[model samples]
Target: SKTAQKRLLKELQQLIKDSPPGIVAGPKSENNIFIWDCLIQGPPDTPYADGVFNAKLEFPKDYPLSPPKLTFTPSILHPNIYPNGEVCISILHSPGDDPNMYELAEERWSPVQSVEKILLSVMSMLSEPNIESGANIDACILWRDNRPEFERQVKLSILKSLGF
Candidate 1:
C-alpha cells in the first residue's frame, strides 16, 4: 500500500546516497519505484571474481511483507541460481514454508532489513554457495565433488561476461 511504497522510496534514496562498495543498485527508471537495476562485483578469490554481474530486482506491492524478486540479467551458472536466473536465497524468500525447504526463519526476510543488506547477501553468496540442496542440480554435483570443473566453468562464464 501507500506505506510500502513510501518505505521503499526511502530505501531507494539511501541506495543512491550511500551504496556500499562492490555494489551499485538503484531504481531502473523514474517511472516506477519498484524495479531496480544493480551492478555487482564478484568477490575476490571466488570463481565469479574478475567479473561484473548485472541484476534486476522487482519488488512486490506488499513491500516489506516480502523481499524483492532478484534475477541475474545474463544469468549465472551457480548451484544457488535457478536456470531462469532467479537467485535462491533465504533473504529473497518469505519466512516459513519456503517452497525450497532450505532456509530457516532467521535467515528469511524481515521487515527491518534494507536493500543494502540484500545486495551484500547476494554478493557473499557468489563466493560461498549452499551446495547441499541446490537450485541447479548439475551445479551442485560439480560444486560438491568436481570442484575444479565447477571453478573452470565459473571462470569461463565470468570471462564471457567481460567479453575477454
Candidate 2:
C-alpha cells in the first residue's frame, strides 16, 4: 500500500510539473501528498468560457488499483455533477461491470489510466454532458426543458464563483 502511494505521489508530482501552462495543481496542504488542489481554465466557446473552476483530487491508498475521487470544490451547475460538488462522470467510476447498467464496462476507470487522462476527461465533460445517467436531475431537466435558462445559470454560477 505504501509503495503504491509513493508511486502515485511521484507520478502526480511529475504531472503537476509538466501540466500545460493554463492548468495548475499542487498539494492542498503541506502535510498530505495524497490530496491535491487544481485549477482549470474553461475551454473557449463553452458556457464556462473564461472561468476558473477549482477542483480537488483524492488518491486512494491503493491507487493505480483504484480510481481517485475528484470533486469540484466550488459548486458548478452541471447535469453530471453531484450536489455535493463531486463529479459523476463515467471515467471516474470504478472499473468492471456496471450494476446500475447505466455505464458500459469500457467507459469506467481502468488501472492503465492516469491522472492526466482523468483531468482531460473532466475537461471534455465540461463541454459535453452525458444526460442519460445524470447525477443532477434538475440540471438535466433544465438543459432539456429550457436551454437558455440552463446556459444562463451555468454562466452565472461561474461568474459568481469567480467574483466577477
Candidate 3:
C-alpha cells in the first residue's frame, strides 16, 4: 500500500510538472489516489485528430506488481479497444504466460513500466491499431475493407465525445 501510494504520488507530480504534448493525467480526486483521469488530445495526421479522448486508469493495490487497467470513456470505434472501452495492449498485460501467444514477453508489463509509458503507448495506439489482435471485430472489418467509412464513424464518435 505504502509503495503504491508513494510511487503514484511522485508519478502524479512529475506528470503535473512536465506533461507530454497533447496529454493530461491526474488522480480523479484527492480522496481517491488509485484512479486517474487522463485526457489525450488526438495526434496530428490521424483519424483521431481534432478530438479529445477521455480515459481512466485504475491502479491495483499491488501496483508495479500489476499494470493498471485503462478504459476509454464514451468508447470510440477502434480495433484494439473493446466496445465497452477496455484497451487491449501488450504493455497492459501482466508478466506471465501469454494467453494470446503473440505478444512478446518483453513488451508485456513489468515493474519498471510507468504510467507515463502506458499513456504514451495508448496515444500511439490511437494512431495505429494492431489489426491482428482485434478487440472490436466490426471495427477491424471496417478499418480494413472500408477505410472511408471507418474514418466517418470515428469522426462521429469524436463529435459525440464532445457533446455535439
Candidate 4:
C-alpha cells in the first residue's frame, strides 16, 4: 500500500543518513521509493579491502513482510554471490523451513529485519562466505582450490571497475 511505501521511504532515508562514513545509499528514482542503490567499501585486510562495491536493493510491494532483493550491479567474484549479481545470503532468503536444508527459518528474513541490518549482513558476507550453498560454483571452487589466484582475480576486477 501507499502507506507502506511512505513508511519505508522515511525509514530508508534515515538509514542512508545514519550509514557509516564510507557507505552511501539513496533512492534510484524520485518516483520509486522502493528501489535503492548502495556502495559499500570493503573492510581492511580482506581481498576486497580498499575497493568499493556497488549494489541495489529492490523492495517488495509488501515490504517488511517480504524481503528485498539485493543484487550487485558491478560484478564481484565471490562464492556466495551469483554470476548474474544476485546475492545468495541467508539473511535475504524468505522465512520458512529450509527445504534446501541449508539455512534455519530463524536465520532468514523476517518483518523485524531492517534495511540497516540487511546492509550490515552484506558486510558480514564479505568477510565470511558460505561455500556450502554458494551461488557461484566457479568462484566457490576457485576460492577453495586456489586462494592466491582467487585473491588476485578479485583485486584485478576491483581495480578494473575503478578504472585504475
Candidate 5:
C-alpha cells in the first residue's frame, strides 16, 4: 500500500505543478486520492471537437506494476470504448493476456507510464480510434462503413454530454 500510495502522491503533485492543455484531473476527494476525476477537452478536427468529456481513473492498491482503470462518464461513441464506457486502449492493457497475442510488451503498461501519459493517450485516441480492437462492435461498423453517420451520432452525443 505504501509503495503505490507514495507514487500516486508524487503524480498528483506533478500534475498540478504543470497541467497539460485540454486536460484537468485530480483526486475525487482529498481523503481518497486513489480515485481521480478527469475532464478532457475533445481533440480538434475530430467529431468530438466541441465537447468536454468526463472520465474517472481508478488506481489499484498495487499500481505502477499493474495499471489504473479509466472509464468515461456520459460515454461517447467510439470504436475503442466499450458500451459501458470503459476505455480499451493498447497501452492500458496489462502484458499478460496479450488478448490478441500481438501487442508487444513494450507497448503495454509499465511502472514508467504516468497519469499524464494515460490522459494524453486518451486525448489522442479521440482524434483517431483504433478500429482494429473494436470494443464496441456497433461503433466500429459505423466508424468504418458509414463515417458520415458515425460523425452524426458522435455530434449528437457531444451535444447531449454538454447538456444541449
Candidate 6:
C-alpha cells in the first residue's frame, strides 16, 4: 500500500512540475492520488480538432505491477473507443492473451509506461484508430469506407463537446 502511494506521489510530483504537451492531468483532489482526471486538447488537422476531451484514470493498489483503468467522461464514437468511451488500445490491454495473436508483448502495458505516455498514445489513437483490431466494429467500417460521414459525425460530437 505504501509503495503504491509513494510511486503515485512521485509521479504526481513529476507531472505537475513538468510534463508533456497537448494534455493535462491530475488527481481528482489533493487527498487522493489514486484517481485522476485528464483533459485533452484535440490534435490539429484531424476529425477530432477543435474538441476538448475528458477522462478518468483509476490506479490499482499495485499500480506498477498492474495497469490503471482509464475511461472517458462522455462517450465518444470511434473505432478504438467504445460507444461509452472506454478506450481499447494495446497499451491499455493487459499482458493477457493477444486475442488477435498478432501484437507483441512489448506493445502492451509495462511498469515503464508513464501516465503521460498513455495519454499521448490515446491522443494519437484518436487520429489514427487501430482499425485492424477495432473494439467498435461499426465505427471501423464507417471510418474505413465512409470517411466523410465518419468525420461529419465526429465533428458533430466535437461540437457538442464545446456546446456549439
Model 4, TM vs. native: 0.87
Q: Candidate 4 on 39-101: residue-level lDDT in tens? A: 999977788997998899888888887888989997688998999999988788776654456
lDDT for model 3 comes to: 0.86
Model 4: lDDT of residue 65:
76
- lDDT of each residue in 1-164, candidate 2, tens digit only: 78776777777778867886457776866568788898988877789877888999888878787788889997688898888989887778775554456645447777777788788888878888888659998999998799899999888877777666
lDDT of each: 0.82, 0.80, 0.86, 0.82, 0.86, 0.82
Worst 10 residues of 2 by lDDT: 97-106
How many Å off is the CA of 86 in candidate 1? 0.3
Per-residue C-alpha lDDT of model 5 across residues 18-66, encoded as one tens digit per residue: 9999899998677698899998988889998899888999999889888
How many steric overlaps does candidate 4 have?
Answer: 0
Q: TM-scores across all candidates?
A: 0.90, 0.86, 0.89, 0.87, 0.91, 0.89
Per-residue lDDT of model 1, residues 67-158, tens digit only: 88999988888998988989888777666655455546447787968888888888888888976436888888889899999899888877
Of 1 and 5, the candidate ahead on TM-score is 5
Model 1 spans with C-alpha error above 4 angstroms: 97-105
Candidate 4's displacement at residue 71, Å, is 0.8
lDDT of 5: 0.86
List where candidate 4 sits over 4 angstroms from the true fold.
98-106
What's the distance in Å from true for residue 41, model 4? 1.2
Best by TM-score: 5
Q: Give the TM-score of candidate 6.
A: 0.89
How many residue pairs clash in each candidate at the backbone level? 0, 0, 0, 0, 0, 0
